[PDB]
């Protein structure tokens, strides 16, 4: 039996057997008052003390969310769908501590992705027991509100201020600050890491002054706030908040009254309507996401980034080789996970309509032009690979690169990686390559489990990545100093060196996707 006293009461965890060792897991610790009733859409409220022994022995409810129903029974999609009950009562977190209890361990806080519409900390690929066992770090992860329940925005108005999901995250960071010492943790040594919308969240915590004292360092996997999907403007936010009020018959004039009306609607009603608050959706739509609330976010984050207004610290940033492909099978014509998705020119052209609906004709022509001068005009994968690259470059790679350039210009050490290994247990077909999110299992050390049909080469890659992540958290330097590893150079805005992660050869390369990103980062914003 293992009971830990925390500032709001006592929590009992459970022992886990890992690699002939032991990790203690505290699954499902509440960190806020359930945001129910009048608390729906408000910032997370402080939790009142309890007196019992809170049995934190299983993952808690995941936050309300729509589920991917596109490939029922297919592990490739369903591995991302929630694996606990959905409920508004979902403000909980998890802690993995090494056994024997550490003395002053570095803490790793995970923030999952999901487009700010989906996700949950309890997923199998977010299990922190391996990191705890292997690197003697403590791993924390939290559930935070997503979708309209997490980001509906009536700016100024506290009933619906926006960014509630971010303040959930923040409230969990405070919990780590006030309690992790009791678990053997070092509150002065906290590294946030997250993927996709989780990564954009991490990057917004570097910008938010209310978070500056809640962590030390930051890791951003396939995501950053300057990505086009990561921040809703005050305009869209209001137009989307107003739209949703219509589809639920909640339209009023008293802005506080439309919120009260939305407060008596059932979570399901709000959920089915989220999709249509935009006129033309894409597979990448983030109908309700972070906004400039004037609280968490005091100005538009591009301006903050550009003028050096963020926490000064080290960052680890990276992306995957095929960020875009995963979204092509959610709408792009001629694409399917069940055939090699050879598409024609017209099909590529139609796909751009799917992914760039509001963009001018000339804008879409300019995308086609920049991506369709072929090394081989006769190669039939040409247009299929091109659309994937378009989506990946525009949505993930180029914003992550631009974020890393701008952040490092203010003097801090930055490290950039390019993950280019396809999981041998990847259930999607080969033409989709090194997909969005399929580095996570490697970061969390799943390939270390020899019982799980990963190759030996994958075990070695996960083992080095785990060491590099942990070295970055403990020491601000993501080296593997022992097994004659390739040294990871800092990313500088001049030379722009990055490290490639793969089973073959880790290499130092320069200026990732240079020609592509100049199009996205300096021509395309004009159109």
Ligand X SMILES: *[C@@H]1O[C@H](CO[C@@H]2O[C@@H](C)[C@@H](O)[C@@H](O)[C@@H]2O)[C@@H](O[C@@H]2O[C@H](CO)[C@@H](O)[C@H](O)[C@H]2NC(C)=O)[C@H](O)[C@H]1NC(C)=O
Ligand Y SMILES: *[C@@H]1O[C@H](CO[C@@H]2O[C@@H](C)[C@@H](O)[C@@H](O)[C@@H]2O)[C@@H](O)[C@H](O)[C@H]1NC(C)=O
Pick the closest to residue 119 from 97, 94, 90 (CA basis): 90
- Residues 228-247 binding ligand X (CB under 6 A) are 239, 243, 246-247
When binding is defined by CB under 6 A, the residue of 256, 268, 340, 424 that contacts ligand NAG is 256
- Using CB under 6 A as the binding rule, the residues of this chain from 172 to 231 that contact ligand Y are 186, 188-189, 216
Longest C-alpha distance within the chain, in Å? Answer: 72
Selection from ligand X, ligand 5HF, ligand NAG, none that 286 binds (CB < 5 to 8 A by kind) is ligand 5HF
64 neighbors 82 (Cβ within 8 angstroms): no
Phi-psi region of 37 (alpha: psi -120 to 50; beta: other; left: phi over 0): left
Binding site for ligand 5HF (CB under 6 A): 66, 68, 80, 113-115, 117-118, 195-196, 229, 284, 286, 326-327, 330, 436-437
Alpha-carbon span 13 to 2, nearest angstrom: 6
What, of ligand X, ligand NAG, ligand 5HF, none, does residue 26 touch, CB below 5 to 8 Å by kind?
none
Sheet holding 497-501, edge to edge: 14-18, 21-30, 92-98, 138-142, 105-111, 185-195, 217-221, 315-320, 414-419, 497-501, 508-510
Q: By CB under 6 A, is residue 333 in contact with ligand X? A: yes
DSSP symbol at 278: S
What, of ligand X, ligand NAG, ligand 5HF, none, does residue 68 touch, CB below 5 to 8 Å by kind? Answer: ligand 5HF
Residue 235 Cβ, how far from ligand X at the closest point, in Å? 7
Order of strands across the sheet that contains 53-55? 3-6, 9-12, 53-55
What are the CA-CA distances from residue 75 to residues 65, 128, 439, 462 (Å)? 19, 21, 16, 22
**Least distance in angstroms from the C-beta of 330 to ligand 5HF:** 5
d(CA 322, CA 419): 9
Residue whose token pair is 């209310």? 210
Which residue in the block uniquely carries the two structure tokens 């490697």? Answer: 442
Q: In terms of CB distance, is 256 or 453 closer to ligand NAG?
A: 256
CB of 342 to ligand X, least distance (A): 5
Q: What's the burial of 18, exposed, middle or buried (CB within 10 Å: 0-12/13-18/19+)?
A: buried
Q: Which residues are catalytic?
A: 196, 323, 436
The contact mask relative to ligand NAG for 413-432 (x = CB under 6 A, - = no) is --------------------
115 is in an annotated binding site: yes
From the list ligand 5HF, ligand NAG, ligand Y, none, partner contacted by residue 115 (C-beta under 5 to 8 A by kind): ligand 5HF
To the nearest whole angstrom, how small is the minimum distance from the Cβ of residue 65 to ligand X? 20
Q: Least Å distance between CB 6 and ligand 5HF? A: 30
Q: And the tokens for 360?
A: 């001018």
* Cβ contact 265:108 at 8 Å: no
Q: Are 519 and 526 in contact (CB under 8 A)?
A: no
E strands, 83-184, are 92-98, 105-111, 138-142
Q: Is 437 annotated as a binding residue?
A: no
Binding-site partner at residue 510 among ligand NAG, ligand Y, ligand 5HF, none, CB < 5 to 8 Å by type: none
The two structure tokens encoding residue 336: 């399917």
Q: Which does 114 bind (CB under 5 to 8 A by kind): ligand NAG, ligand Y, ligand 5HF, none?
A: ligand 5HF
Nearer to ligand X, 8 or 243 (CB): 243
Give the per-residue contact string, 290-319, with ligand X (x = CB under 6 A; - = no). Answer: ------------------------------
If binding means CB under 6 A, how many residues of this protein chain bind ligand Y?
16
Residue 370 neighbours by CB under 8 Å, 6+ apart: 516, 519
Nearest approach in angstroms of CB 331 to ligand X is 8
Numbered residues of the known binding site for substrate: 114-115
Residues near ligand Y (CB under 6 A): 1, 14, 55, 57, 103-104, 186, 188-189, 216, 463-464, 467, 480, 482-483
Question: Residues interacting with ligand NAG, by CB under 6 A?
Answer: 254, 256-257
Annotated binding site: 80, 114-115, 436
């Amino acid at each position: 039996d293992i009971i830990i006293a925390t500032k709001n009461g006592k929590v009992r965890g459970m022992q886990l057997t890992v690699f002939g060792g032991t990790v203690t897991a505290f699954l499902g610790i509440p960190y806020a008052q359930p945001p129910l009733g009048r608390l729906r859409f408000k910032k997370p409220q402080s939790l009142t003390k309890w007196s019992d022994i809170w049995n934190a022995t299983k993952y808690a409810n995941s936050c309300c969310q729509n589920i991917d129903q596109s490939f029922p029974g297919f592990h490739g999609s369903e591995m991302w769908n929630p694996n606990t009950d959905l409920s508004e009562d979902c403000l909980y977190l998890n802690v993995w501590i090494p056994a024997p209890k550490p003395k002053n361990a570095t803490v790793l806080i995970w923030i999952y992705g999901g487009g700010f519409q989906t996700g949950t900390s309890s997923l199998h690929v977010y299990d922190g027991k391996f990191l705890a066992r292997v690197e003697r770090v403590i791993v924390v992860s939290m559930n935070y509100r997503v979708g309209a329940l997490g980001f509906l925005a009536l700016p100024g108005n506290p009933e619906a201020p926006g960014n509630m999901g971010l303040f959930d995250q923040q409230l969990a960071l405070q919990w780590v600050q006030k309690n992790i010492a009791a678990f053997g943790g070092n509150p002065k040594s906290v590294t946030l890491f997250g993927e996709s919308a989780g990564a954009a969240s991490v990057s917004l915590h570097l910008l938010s002054p209310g978070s500056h004292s809640l962590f030390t360092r930051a890791i951003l996997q396939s995501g950053s706030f300057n990505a086009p999907w990561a921040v809703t403007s005050l305009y869209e936010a209001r137009n989307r908040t107003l739209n949703l009020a219509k589809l639920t018959g909640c339209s009023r004039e008293n802005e506080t009254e439309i919120i009260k009306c939305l407060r008596n609607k059932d979570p399901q009603e709000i959920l089915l309507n989220e999709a249509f608050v935009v006129p033309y959706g894409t597979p990448l739509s983030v109908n309700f996401g972070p906004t400039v609330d004037g609280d968490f976010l005091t100005d538009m984050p591009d301006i903050l980034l550009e003028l050096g207004q963020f926490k000064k610290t080290q960052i680890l940033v990276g992306v995957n080789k095929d960020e875009g492909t995963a979204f092509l099978v959610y709408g792009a014509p001629g694409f399917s996970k069940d055939n090699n998705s050879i598409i024609t020119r017209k099909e590529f052209q139609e796909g751009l309509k799917i992914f760039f609906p509001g963009v001018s004709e000339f804008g879409k022509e300019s995308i086609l032009f920049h991506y369709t001068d072929w090394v081989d005009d006769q190669r039939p994968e040409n247009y299929r690979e091109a659309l994937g690259d378009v989506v990946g470059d525009y949505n993930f790679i180029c914003p992550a690169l631009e974020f890393t350039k701008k952040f490092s210009e203010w003097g801090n050490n930055a490290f950039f990686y390019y993950f280019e290994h396809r999981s041998s247990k990847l259930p999607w077909p080969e033409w989709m390559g090194v997909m969005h999110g399929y580095e996570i299992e490697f970061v969390f050390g799943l390939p270390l489990e020899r019982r799980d049909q990963y190759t030996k080469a994958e075990e070695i890659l996960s083992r080095s990545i785990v060491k590099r992540w942990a070295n970055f958290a403990k020491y601000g330097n993501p080296q593997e100093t022992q097994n004659q590893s390739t040294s990871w150079p800092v990313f500088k805005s001049t030379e722009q060196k990055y490290l490639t992660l793969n089973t073959e050869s880790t290499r130092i390369m320069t200026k990732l996707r240079a020609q592509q990103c100049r199009f996205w980062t300096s021509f395309f914003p004009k159109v």
